Design an enzyme around this catalytic site. Structure first.
Site, PDB file in Angstrom:
ATOM      1  N   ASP A  43      -7.913 -13.052  15.917  1.00 26.90           N
ATOM      2  CA  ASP A  43      -8.522 -11.505  16.651  1.00 26.90           C
ATOM      3  C   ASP A  43      -8.599 -11.409  17.983  1.00 26.90           C
ATOM      4  OD1 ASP A  43     -10.033  -9.153  15.632  1.00 26.90           O
ATOM      5  OD2 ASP A  43     -11.430 -10.164  17.071  1.00 26.90           O
ATOM      6  N   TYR A  48     -11.065  -8.268  25.874  1.00 32.45           N
ATOM      7  CA  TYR A  48     -11.380  -9.793  26.044  1.00 32.45           C
ATOM      8  C   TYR A  48     -10.604 -10.363  27.280  1.00 32.45           C
ATOM      9  CZ  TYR A  48     -12.984  -8.868  21.159  1.00 32.45           C
ATOM     10  OH  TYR A  48     -13.632  -8.155  20.023  1.00 32.45           O
ATOM     11  N   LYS A  77      -6.882  -4.467  19.488  1.00 34.97           N
ATOM     12  CA  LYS A  77      -7.902  -3.213  19.579  1.00 34.97           C
ATOM     13  C   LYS A  77      -7.817  -2.409  20.708  1.00 34.97           C
ATOM     14  CE  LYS A  77     -11.153  -6.358  17.434  1.00 34.97           C
ATOM     15  NZ  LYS A  77     -11.169  -7.607  18.493  1.00 34.97           N
ATOM     16  N   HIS A 110     -11.135   0.218  18.616  1.00 35.33           N
ATOM     17  CA  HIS A 110     -12.096  -0.634  19.158  1.00 35.33           C
ATOM     18  C   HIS A 110     -13.684  -0.458  18.607  1.00 35.33           C
ATOM     19  CE1 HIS A 110     -12.883  -4.979  21.304  1.00 35.33           C
ATOM     20  NE2 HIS A 110     -13.664  -4.710  20.397  1.00 35.33           N
TER      21      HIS A 110
HETATM   22  N1  LIG Z   1     -15.017  -5.660  16.752  1.00 31.81           N
HETATM   23  C1  LIG Z   1     -15.963  -5.910  17.834  1.00 31.81           C
HETATM   24  O1  LIG Z   1     -16.699  -4.852  18.228  1.00 31.81           O
HETATM   25  C2  LIG Z   1     -16.406  -7.314  17.999  1.00 31.81           C
HETATM   26  C3  LIG Z   1     -17.673  -7.662  18.311  1.00 31.81           C
HETATM   27  C4  LIG Z   1     -18.062  -9.001  18.468  1.00 31.81           C
HETATM   28  C5  LIG Z   1     -17.118  -9.654  18.066  1.00 31.81           C
HETATM   29  N2  LIG Z   1     -15.896  -9.602  17.775  1.00 31.81           N
HETATM   30  C6  LIG Z   1     -15.007 -10.602  17.232  1.00 31.81           C
HETATM   31  O2  LIG Z   1     -15.571 -11.609  16.519  1.00 31.81           O
HETATM   32  C7  LIG Z   1     -15.449 -13.044  17.265  1.00 31.81           C
HETATM   33  C8  LIG Z   1     -16.646 -13.882  16.840  1.00 31.81           C
HETATM   34  O3  LIG Z   1     -18.021 -13.173  17.252  1.00 31.81           O
HETATM   35  P1  LIG Z   1     -18.539 -13.798  18.536  1.00 31.81           P
HETATM   36  O4  LIG Z   1     -17.620 -14.255  19.352  1.00 31.81           O
HETATM   37  O5  LIG Z   1     -19.564 -12.701  18.838  1.00 31.81           O
HETATM   38  O6  LIG Z   1     -19.559 -15.073  17.959  1.00 31.81           O
HETATM   39  P2  LIG Z   1     -19.673 -15.912  16.718  1.00 31.81           P
HETATM   40  O7  LIG Z   1     -18.319 -16.383  16.441  1.00 31.81           O
HETATM   41  O8  LIG Z   1     -20.537 -15.540  15.830  1.00 31.81           O
HETATM   42  O9  LIG Z   1     -20.408 -17.182  17.607  1.00 31.81           O
HETATM   43  C9  LIG Z   1     -19.472 -17.818  19.068  1.00 31.81           C
HETATM   44  C10 LIG Z   1     -20.276 -19.069  19.224  1.00 31.81           C
HETATM   45  O10 LIG Z   1     -20.631 -19.790  18.338  1.00 31.81           O
HETATM   46  C11 LIG Z   1     -20.397 -21.244  18.746  1.00 31.81           C
HETATM   47  N3  LIG Z   1     -19.818 -22.033  17.850  1.00 31.81           N
HETATM   48  C12 LIG Z   1     -18.450 -21.708  17.192  1.00 31.81           C
HETATM   49  N4  LIG Z   1     -18.445 -22.572  16.016  1.00 31.81           N
HETATM   50  C13 LIG Z   1     -19.594 -23.279  16.064  1.00 31.81           C
HETATM   51  C14 LIG Z   1     -19.907 -24.464  15.291  1.00 31.81           C
HETATM   52  N5  LIG Z   1     -19.462 -25.069  14.264  1.00 31.81           N
HETATM   53  N6  LIG Z   1     -21.078 -25.220  15.525  1.00 31.81           N
HETATM   54  C15 LIG Z   1     -21.774 -24.497  16.794  1.00 31.81           C
HETATM   55  N7  LIG Z   1     -21.569 -23.745  17.444  1.00 31.81           N
HETATM   56  C16 LIG Z   1     -20.347 -22.995  17.158  1.00 31.81           C
HETATM   57  C17 LIG Z   1     -19.246 -21.107  19.781  1.00 31.81           C
HETATM   58  O11 LIG Z   1     -19.323 -21.917  20.930  1.00 31.81           O
HETATM   59  P3  LIG Z   1     -17.925 -22.670  21.648  1.00 31.81           P
HETATM   60  O12 LIG Z   1     -16.885 -21.424  21.633  1.00 31.81           O
HETATM   61  O13 LIG Z   1     -18.407 -22.981  22.737  1.00 31.81           O
HETATM   62  O14 LIG Z   1     -17.355 -23.663  20.598  1.00 31.81           O
HETATM   63  C18 LIG Z   1     -19.733 -19.563  20.289  1.00 31.81           C
HETATM   64  O15 LIG Z   1     -20.858 -19.814  21.328  1.00 31.81           O
HETATM   65  C19 LIG Z   1     -15.288 -12.605  18.616  1.00 31.81           C
HETATM   66  O16 LIG Z   1     -14.898 -13.528  19.265  1.00 31.81           O
HETATM   67  C20 LIG Z   1     -14.270 -11.464  18.242  1.00 31.81           C
HETATM   68  O17 LIG Z   1     -13.040 -11.923  18.110  1.00 31.81           O
HETATM   69  C21 LIG Z   1     -15.292  -8.339  17.477  1.00 31.81           C
HETATM   70  O1  LIG Z   2     -16.405  -5.174  21.810  1.00 33.50           O
HETATM   71  C1  LIG Z   2     -16.463  -6.429  21.167  1.00 33.50           C
HETATM   72  O2  LIG Z   2     -15.318  -6.692  20.470  1.00 33.50           O
HETATM   73  C2  LIG Z   2     -17.284  -7.411  21.806  1.00 33.50           C
HETATM   74  C3  LIG Z   2     -18.101  -7.016  22.956  1.00 33.50           C
HETATM   75  N1  LIG Z   2     -19.185  -6.078  22.664  1.00 33.50           N
HETATM   76  N2  LIG Z   2     -19.946  -5.637  23.801  1.00 33.50           N
HETATM   77  C4  LIG Z   2     -20.972  -4.985  23.206  1.00 33.50           C
HETATM   78  C5  LIG Z   2     -20.733  -3.772  23.018  1.00 33.50           C
HETATM   79  N3  LIG Z   2     -21.536  -2.893  22.292  1.00 33.50           N
HETATM   80  C6  LIG Z   2     -21.017  -1.505  22.396  1.00 33.50           C
HETATM   81  C7  LIG Z   2     -21.408  -0.373  21.749  1.00 33.50           C
HETATM   82  C8  LIG Z   2     -20.621   0.728  21.859  1.00 33.50           C
HETATM   83  C9  LIG Z   2     -21.040   2.041  21.420  1.00 33.50           C
HETATM   84  F1  LIG Z   2     -20.169   2.526  20.144  1.00 33.50           F
HETATM   85  F2  LIG Z   2     -21.430   2.904  21.778  1.00 33.50           F
HETATM   86  F3  LIG Z   2     -22.133   1.664  20.358  1.00 33.50           F
HETATM   87  C10 LIG Z   2     -19.419   0.989  22.702  1.00 33.50           C
HETATM   88  C11 LIG Z   2     -18.893  -0.218  23.341  1.00 33.50           C
HETATM   89  C12 LIG Z   2     -19.597  -1.332  23.338  1.00 33.50           C
HETATM   90  S1  LIG Z   2     -19.302  -3.146  23.929  1.00 33.50           S
HETATM   91  C13 LIG Z   2     -19.576  -5.814  25.213  1.00 33.50           C
HETATM   92  O3  LIG Z   2     -20.448  -5.284  25.910  1.00 33.50           O
HETATM   93  C14 LIG Z   2     -18.144  -6.546  25.331  1.00 33.50           C
HETATM   94  N4  LIG Z   2     -17.969  -6.545  26.680  1.00 33.50           N
HETATM   95  C15 LIG Z   2     -16.565  -7.118  26.793  1.00 33.50           C
HETATM   96  C16 LIG Z   2     -16.030  -7.496  25.972  1.00 33.50           C
HETATM   97  N5  LIG Z   2     -16.255  -7.583  24.511  1.00 33.50           N
HETATM   98  C17 LIG Z   2     -17.621  -6.833  24.323  1.00 33.50           C
END
Ligand SMILES: NC(=O)c1ccc[n+]([C@@H]2O[C@H](COP(=O)([O-])OP(=O)(O)OC[C@H]3O[C@@H](n4cnc5c(N)ncnc54)[C@H](OP(=O)(O)O)[C@@H]3O)[C@@H](O)[C@H]2O)c1
Ligand SMILES: O=C(O)Cc1nn(Cc2nc3cc(C(F)(F)F)ccc3s2)c(=O)c2nccnc12
Ligand SMILES: O=C(O)Cc1nn(Cc2nc3cc(C(F)(F)F)ccc3s2)c(=O)c2nccnc12
Length: 315
Positions: A43, A48, A77, A110
């Site tokens: 992903d 990022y 995204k 995104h």
């Molecule tokens: N679509 C969106 O708006 C959106 C938003 C947020 C996230 N995402 C995607 O979702 C992914 C995952 O979410 P996230 O990055 O927010 O957080 P997450 O995967 O819930 O947590 C990541 C954290 O957990 C730690 N970690 C991982 N495996 C672990 C384990 N086995 N034991 C202990 N700690 C562990 C990592 O440490 P280390 O890396 O230091 O090992 C890091 O600090 C993102 O990276 C991104 O690709 C998408």
């Molecule tokens: O968007 C992601 O996949 C993770 C991510 N989340 N966030 C928190 C965010 N939250 C939001 C919320 C909105 C919303 F749609 F207005 F709600 C729009 C954009 C964002 S970005 C960051 O500030 C952020 N900044 C840099 C890179 N990633 C992020």
């Protein structure tokens, strides 16, 4: 099962590696390790700021013949500053160039909120608020649709859309492609039952992000609740001789959600992959669901005023 069938006929691996907050200097090694371990889904996102370094890893593992391109599922995204119809293709091609791929398996909008186009990821006005663009979801969708027709991406979808925003796309007159996926925050403190039920009912696959509660998000406060340290979840883990992370990864999987835990740590990338050889009980699942508290780690609260802010609706 280890893959879920999408509405475009493709099989999406139910476990992927997250790459938000993975720095350029560590993400190449992380992706190489994940692929070695057996992950087949990465992903990614333009925002990022590490797609180049993700690209380098994939190229190496292809060259090493550890994996073939068609066995990989790469997601990226479209960032908020590119919602203008005319900007969508350029954004997609820039991501492709950085990843060094010919196509994406899946490209998402995104967030529903368009921001002002430009160099900044979060363009601020004089008041210190994010500047919106005059863009709408249906026109951005139309431009995403065109990427499929051109064969740049195998599938398109959305991320952080509420059910009304999804419905808006599904009911679009002249719709060409339904969203394949809605990627949303999902974990025991934000269990998302209603939006999951809605999406699944429409044949849309849900991906659960921040499954471990994103403890490394820049804004975490020490008083924030912590899934990895919840004793209730450790007890469930201990019962299976697994880690808390493994439980937190297994949980979405048993709800037929894709899940994308992030690590740059080889040992944890490996640990996080060991989720196919155990099963949470139905009581375990019920219990984990009961921990919901509508706690949301990604919510940019100052964007509540944006016409497309997703989190006013109940789901
Ligand atoms: N679509 C969106 O708006 C959106 C938003 C947020 C996230 N995402 C995607 O979702 C992914 C995952 O979410 P996230 O990055 O927010 O957080 P997450 O995967 O819930 O947590 C990541 C954290 O957990 C730690 N970690 C991982 N495996 C672990 C384990 N086995 N034991 C202990 N700690 C562990 C990592 O440490 P280390 O890396 O230091 O090992 C890091 O600090 C993102 O990276 C991104 O690709 C998408
Ligand atoms: O968007 C992601 O996949 C993770 C991510 N989340 N966030 C928190 C965010 N939250 C939001 C919320 C909105 C919303 F749609 F207005 F709600 C729009 C954009 C964002 S970005 C960051 O500030 C952020 N900044 C840099 C890179 N990633 C992020
Ligand atoms: O607002 C806080 O105190 C921390 C926090 N930050 N973020 C990420 C961001 N928050 C902002 C806020 C701004 C702005 F300048 F206020 F407009 C600009 C860019 C970003 S990226 C969340 O998404 C976020 N989501 C939920 C809860 N807190 C946050």
């Amino acid at each position: 099962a280890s893959r879920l069938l999408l509405n475009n006929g493709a099989k999406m691996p139910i476990l992927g590696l997250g790459t938000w907050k993975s720095p350029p200097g560590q993400v190449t090694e992380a992706v190489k390790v994940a692929i070695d371990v057996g992950y087949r889904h990465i992903d990614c996102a333009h925002v990022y700021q590490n797609e180049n370094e993700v690209g380098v890893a994939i190229q190496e593992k292809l060259r090493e013949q550890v994996v073939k391109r068609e066995e990989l599922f790469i997601v990226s995204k479209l960032w908020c500053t590119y919602h203008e119809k005319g900007l969508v293709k350029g954004a997609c091609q820039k991501t492709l160039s950085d990843l060094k791929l010919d196509y994406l398996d899946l490209y998402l909008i995104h967030w529903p909120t368009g921001f002002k186009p430009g160099k900044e990821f979060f363009p601020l006005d004089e008041s210190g608020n994010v500047v919106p663009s005059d863009t709408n979801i249906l026109d951005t969708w139309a431009a995403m649709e065109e990427l499929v027709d051109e064969g740049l991406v195998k599938a398109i979808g959305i991320s952080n859309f509420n059910h009304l925003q999804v419905e808006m796309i599904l009911n679009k007159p002249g719709l060409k492609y339904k969203p394949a996926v809605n990627q949303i925050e999902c974990h025991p403190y934000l269990t998302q039952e209603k939006l999951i039920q809605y999406c699944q009912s429409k044949g849309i696959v849900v991906t659960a992000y921040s499954p471990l509660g994103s403890p490394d998000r820049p804004w975490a406060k020490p008083e924030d609740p912590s899934l990895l340290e919840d004793p209730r979840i450790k007890a469930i883990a201990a019962k299976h001789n697994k880690t808390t992370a493994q439980v937190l990864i297994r949980f979405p999987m048993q709800r037929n959600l894709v899940v994308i835990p992030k690590s740059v740590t080889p040992e944890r990338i490996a640990e996080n992959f060991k989720v196919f050889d155990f099963e949470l009980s139905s009581q375990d699942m019920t219990t984990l669901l009961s921990y919901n508290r509508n706690w949301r780690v990604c919510a940019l609260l100052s964007c509540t005023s944006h016409k497309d802010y997703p989190f006013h609706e109940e789901f």
